[PDB]
Design a protein around this ligand. Structure first.
Ligand code: WO7
Length: 460
């Protein structure tokens, strides 16, 4: 049996509105309804991994696992294995995989983050799962962010607390948050961003939805506008939305949006909105292709419709040579020329780099760079030709060109990271000086840039 170089991943998000689901939810897992839907000819083909995020989920873990497994068995005739299940309050994530993958999946982690303080701590936050699939790290975050059209800033704060504090993936990657720990990171949920139009425009919005004219609505979608202004989800992708707003429906039909203010809404309007979303971030030059992104039309127990997204995702094998793992391969090396970090920090302290990668026996600390002033006020940390020669564990180009180097720039005084980034070794050429570049972030905010040249030697 050859190891896969691609898998398909199903992501679902559903706010169940504290109601049990209907007896049939197969349309969700088949990516049928509105938007970018899956071809009928694929219906019996199982995805490799199914990741199900719920919010306002009234079921026990056992009740929901039985419904999910029985659903997938009906569709595919496959009995899926439970990889992980984690619940915080009424926020839940389930990971299911094809039985053939049981011995390809390892290092399973779960965690949660509770968002808000006192008033605002009690029901919002995130759950997450990570694991290795052979040589590829996968992370999954299901978040239920703050509700209400006038709380987009709170939602952005909730996002930053989740990416700082969710403890998934390799704990040896200590400088890096979840936005750098995974080959592929999927973040989904009831993110609760709204279409930010006047209340008086409610009936116009409904009209536009009935005409399937989403353009004038998406131009006011708070997640798209906040992402365009770099306020949230920096360096994440989302497929184009071609399905109707998934909130807020009258239950037991999809024919009516319930938007008017009620005691039960805290006298808030719920204009039709794309509350329920799937986003991703993969390391540079890894295969990831969205093959579906849409909402179901036939599941109506909740005031939200379920959302599905499916992906092709590149994966690598668990590589063994005569040498590494357990030693270096003298035939491999990674060199860096003309490198410098540009930092937004107003501070004047010395900096050094740390290089982290599963292609190294352990992380590598550089010497301090030389600080200079940029011509527009910036701090420029020059490394010139001073960065170490990195010694990978395996020199085979079929392995090494698929790897990535995480970079942190750290203060000498405090050893705190000021910026994190990632460089692909998927180069156009080996033994050749080539430009490299990554933005640097800290707590998911842009803090600088790292650029220079790389020269990669493989056994070929
Ligand atoms: C061929 C196949 O795998 N299927 C799965 C669903 C059950 N009935 C038949 C079709």
């Amino acid at each position: 049996q050859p190891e896969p170089d691609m898998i398909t991943i199903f992501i679902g998000t559903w706010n169940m509105g504290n109601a049990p689901p209907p007896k049939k939810i197969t349309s969700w897992f088949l990516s049928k309804g509105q938007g970018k839907t899956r071809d009928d000819s694929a219906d019996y083909i199982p995805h490799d991994i199914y990741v199900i995020g719920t919010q306002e989920d009234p079921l026990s873990e056992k009740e929901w696992l039985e419904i999910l497994k029985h659903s997938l068995q009906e569709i595919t005739s496959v009995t899926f294995k439970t990889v992980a299940i984690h619940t915080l309050w009424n926020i839940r994530i389930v990971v299911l995989a094809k039985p053939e993958h049981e011995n390809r999946i390892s290092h399973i982690c779960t965690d949660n983050v509770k968002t808000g303080i006192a008033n605002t701590l009690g029901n919002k936050g995130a759950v997450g799962v990570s694991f290795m699939f052979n040589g590829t790290s996968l992370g999954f975050v299901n978040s239920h962010l703050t509700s209400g059209s006038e709380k987009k800033l709170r939602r952005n704060q909730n996002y930053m607390n989740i990416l700082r504090f969710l403890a998934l993936g390799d704990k040896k990657l200590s400088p890096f948050n979840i936005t750098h720990r995974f080959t592929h990171l999927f973040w989904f949920g009831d993110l609760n961003y709204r279409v930010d139009l006047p209340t008086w425009e409610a009936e116009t919005i409904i009209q536009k939805i009935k005409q399937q004219q989403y353009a004038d609505l998406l131009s006011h979608d708070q997640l798209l506008t906040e992402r365009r202004e770099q306020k949230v989800f920096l360096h994440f992708e989302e497929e184009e939305i071609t399905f109707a707003p998934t909130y807020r429906f009258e239950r037991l039909t999809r024919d009516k949006y319930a938007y008017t203010k009620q005691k039960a809404t805290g006298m808030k309007y719920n204009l039709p909105s794309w509350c329920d979303r799937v986003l991703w971030k993969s390391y540079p030059l890894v295969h990831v292709v969205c093959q579906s992104y849409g909402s179901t039309s036939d599941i109506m127990t909740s005031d939200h419709s379920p959302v599905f997204a499916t992906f092709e995702a590149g994966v690598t094998s668990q590589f063994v040579s005569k040498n590494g793992p357990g030693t270096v391969d003298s035939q491999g090396q990674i060199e860096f020329l003309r490198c410098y970090a540009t930092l937004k920090t107003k501070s004047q302290t010395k900096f050094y780099l740390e290089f982290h990668s599963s292609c190294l026996e352990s992380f590598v600390k550089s010497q301090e760079g030389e600080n200079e002033e940029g011509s527009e006020g910036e701090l420029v940390v020059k490394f010139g030709e001073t960065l170490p020669k990195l010694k990978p564990i395996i020199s085979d180009p079929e392995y090494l060109l698929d790897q990535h180097i995480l970079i942190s720039i750290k203060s000498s005084d405090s050893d705190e990271s000021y910026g994190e980034g990632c460089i692909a070794l998927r180069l156009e050429a080996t033994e050749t000086q080539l430009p490299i570049y990554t933005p640097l972030t800290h707590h998911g905010e842009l803090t600088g840039h790292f650029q220079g040249e790389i020269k990669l030697q493989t056994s070929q």
